[PDB]
Structure formats: structure tokens, C-alpha cells
From a paper:
To gain insights into the catalytic mechanism of Dpa, we used a catalytically impaired version of the enzyme carrying Y128F mutation that allowed us to determine the structure of Dpa bound to 1,3-DAP and acCoA. The compromised activity of DpaY128F allowed us to observe the post-catalysis state of the reaction with Ac-1,3-DAP bound to one of the two DpaY128F of the dimer. The other monomer of DpaY128F was bound to 1,3-DAP that was oriented slightly differently in the active site. Binding of the polyamine pre- or post-catalysis did not introduce major structural rearrangements. Interestingly, the orientation of 1,3-DAP in the active site of Dpa observed in the crystal structure was similar to that observed in mouse polyamine acetyltransferase SSAT14, suggesting that these subfamilies are functionally related. Two densities corresponding to metal ions occupied symmetrical positions at the dimer interface and coordinate D80 and D81, damping the negative charges of the active site. At the other end of the active site, 1,3-DAP is stabilized by contacts to E116 of one subunit and F139 of the other, both located at the narrow entrance of the β-swap channel, together with α1 Y25 and V71 of the β3-β4 turn.
The crystal structure of Dpa reveals topological and functional differences from other bacterial polyamine acetyltransferases, adopting a β-swapped quaternary arrangement similar to that of eukaryotic polyamine acetyltransferases with a central size exclusion channel that sieves through the cellular polyamine pool. The structure of Dpa revealed a dimeric architecture with a conserved acCoA and an acidic polyamine binding site formed at the dimer interface that shares properties with other polyamine acetyltransferases.
Author numbering:
A (entry chain A): -2 to 147
B (entry chain B): -1 to 147
Write the structure that this text describes.
Amino acid sequence: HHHMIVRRATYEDLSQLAVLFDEYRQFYGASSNLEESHHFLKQRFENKESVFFIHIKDEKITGFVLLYLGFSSVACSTYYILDDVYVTPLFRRQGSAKQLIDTAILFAKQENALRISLETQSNNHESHRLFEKMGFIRDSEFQTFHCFLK
Amino acid sequence: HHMIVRRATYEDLSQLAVLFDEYRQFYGASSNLEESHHFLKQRFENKESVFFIHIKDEKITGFVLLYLGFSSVACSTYYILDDVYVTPLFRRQGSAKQLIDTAILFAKQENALRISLETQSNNHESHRLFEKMGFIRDSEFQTFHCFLK
Ligand SMILES: CC(C)(COP(=O)(O)OP(=O)(O)OC[C@H]1O[C@@H](n2cnc3c(N)ncnc32)[C@H](O)[C@@H]1OP(=O)(O)O)[C@@H](O)C(=O)NCCC(=O)NCCS
Ligand SMILES: CC(C)(COP(=O)(O)OP(=O)(O)OC[C@H]1O[C@@H](n2cnc3c(N)ncnc32)[C@H](O)[C@@H]1OP(=O)(O)O)[C@@H](O)C(=O)NCCC(=O)NCCS
Ligand SMILES: CC(=O)NCCCN
Ligand SMILES: [Mg+2]
Ligand SMILES: [Mg+2]
């Protein structure tokens, strides 16, 4: 029996998780649309190489982390991408993101991943403090490029 | 036809492994055709991966490997241009240009938001290539890594 847990998300959690997923999208500039957020959360959940971990405190989902499998051609090995991390404001600064990333790290090690990689906004200093505390090192060697199609 | 940029098939993998091993060596890996081919086949069997090869008179001159990406913010998919390589003998002949032009057409057909990639900051050649193909340098995001091995 427990009162707090970080565990893999299930289909049964998607309805509650969609609210936090919609909040994460709003943080990134998106207009709130619970129905759209939920439909796409279901597509990502039903994607073979994606893994969602959620943080539940007193039966409430406080946050989540979405990871997906990466393939490193140079190393000829897999790794994990920490795609999205979010904690709802009511539960911030209580160690939720820390616990979510700690479980993400233990999971990646269990999967013999090379590393966990991510990209976060340069203007998001709060996230840089979180990732550095968790053992992430800033990549300097690479430059991102986008070719916009729509 | 005498030249073509097309999807890779199972039959191209023995020859494609040689190019993929060459691409690995450019990024500093030791040559190992068995390891290169085994991983190439694992990526080729991934349902979200897409390989295009440039073939000049039955010789593979180069390739591009793309994979599906999900944008949570846009609630839409996109493509990541993961690997691009042209064997030195066939360089500065438009092989990479044709591979990327095909990748863009494929991404548009798939209704992708964009094609995204990462390349070394000191790789002058790749920056000229991607800029020629309409890619824009983006420094609004910072990459972090948590090394496990
Ligand atoms: C960033 C975010 C995930 C942090 O979640 P959280 O549960 O509040 O974080 P924690 O309580 O585990 O904090 C862990 C560490 O992160 C850093 N951190 C977290 N919030 C911070 C803040 N507001 N300012 C500075 N550092 C902060 C600190 O180093 C902190 O350690 P400390 O509290 O001992 O100083 C949360 O604020 C959030 O959802 N933000 C919006 C989405 C986002 O930016 N995600 C990252 C990109 S995917
Ligand atoms: C980069 C690379 C793929 C280019 O392949 P390529 O088939 O020779 O390229 P193309 O002939 O299609 O050239 C397309 C454009 O790229 C640029 N380019 C290509 N080679 C270049 C070079 N040596 N110097 C400068 N710009 C160059 C030019 O803008 C060129 O247009 P142009 O020929 O009209 O001037 C090839 O040099 C290679 O395999 N390099 C090693 C692997 C690599 O760097 N891949 C990317 C790592 S993330
Ligand atoms: C950690 C992080 O990547 N945040 C941006 C969300 C799209 N990847
Ligand atoms: Mg890769
Ligand atoms: Mg994403």
C-alpha cells in the first residue's frame, strides 16, 4: 500500500493525464483543447516505442514524463529521448519532476540505453536547473536545423 | 532510367551496409561491417523509419535515413532527417540534393509539419547543404544528455 507513486501510465489514466498534457501544450503556446490533446495523447500512448511515466500523489496525477526510443547509427545502439516533462502548478517544487526523471533514468539503464537525450528551450532556465540537477550535460557540439513544410 | 533515388529494399542492404559503415567512420566509429549491417537491418525493419538511396548505374552512391517524430505542442507528426551520407567518389554531383529533395516530397505527401535535424556545428559542408535545401538554423532549443554508458 502506498500514498505516492511514479509508475507507467495505463489506458485508464489517459482521461486524467490529458488535462496535464493539455496544460503542457499551453506552456508551449498552444490553445487549450482538451479533446485534441486527449486524442493525440492516445496516439502517442499507442505508439510502440513510447513510454509514459506519471506521478500520482494522493490519487491525483501531479505530473508526467514522455520518453521514446532513439537509434544511434554511430554507436549502433539505442537510447531514450525525454520528449516532454510537466508538473501541474499546484504540485510544483515538491520533487515530482525529480522523481519522474529518476524513474526515467532507472528505466533507461534497465533497457541498456546509451543515454537519455532531450532538447528544451534556451529561454527555459527552470528546466535547465532541473536537468543539470539530474545529471544532464548541455550539448555544445550540435546545431539543430528545421525545414518548415506547413 | 540510369540513375534513381528510391526507397531502400532488403536486396540493397548488403551494399548499403558498406555506405552506412563509412558514415559511422566519418562520425568516429571503428569499421565493423557485421555490427553496421545488423543495426542497419534493425532500423530498416522499424515501421517508423524511411530509407532513400541514390543509385548511379546499380552502384549506391549515398543515402538518407528519416524517422517519424511527434510534436505534442502541434498535435501532429513530423520527420527527423537522422543520417545523410554520400560516398566521397560520388560527392559534389547533386546526390545529397536529390536525396533531400525526395525526403521533402515524401514528408509533404505524409502531411508532416517539418523535417528536423541535428548536425555538428563545425561541419561546414552539412550546413551549406541543409541551407541550400531550405533548412533554417535553429538555436532557440538547447540539447542536454545524461550519459549512461
Ligand atoms: C520544470 C518543471 C517540470 C519542474 O517540475 P517540479 O516538480 O516543480 O520540479 P522539482 O520540484 O522536482 O524540482 C527539482 C529541481 O528542478 C529545479 N527547478 C524546479 N523548478 C524550478 C524553478 N521554478 N526555478 C528554478 N529551478 C527550478 C531545481 O534545481 C529543483 O531542485 P530544488 O527544488 O532543490 O532547487 C515544471 O515547473 C514544469 O512543468 N514546467 C513547465 C514545463 C517544462 O518547462 N518542462 C521542461 C521541458 S520538457
Ligand atoms: C555532406 C554530404 C552529404 C554532401 O553530399 P553531396 O552529394 O556531395 O552534396 P551535393 O553534391 O548534393 O551538394 C549539395 C550542396 O551541398 C553543399 N555542399 C556539398 N559539398 C560541399 C562542400 N564540400 N563544401 C561546401 N558546400 C558543400 C553545397 O551547397 C552544394 O550545392 P552546390 O554543389 O550547388 O554548391 C557529403 O559531403 C557527406 O557525405 N559528408 C559526410 C557525412 C556528413 O557530413 N553528413 C551529415 C552529418 S549530420
Ligand atoms: C524536454 C523537451 O524536449 N521539451 C520540448 C517538447 C518537445 N520535445
Ligand atoms: Mg539517431
Ligand atoms: Mg516531440
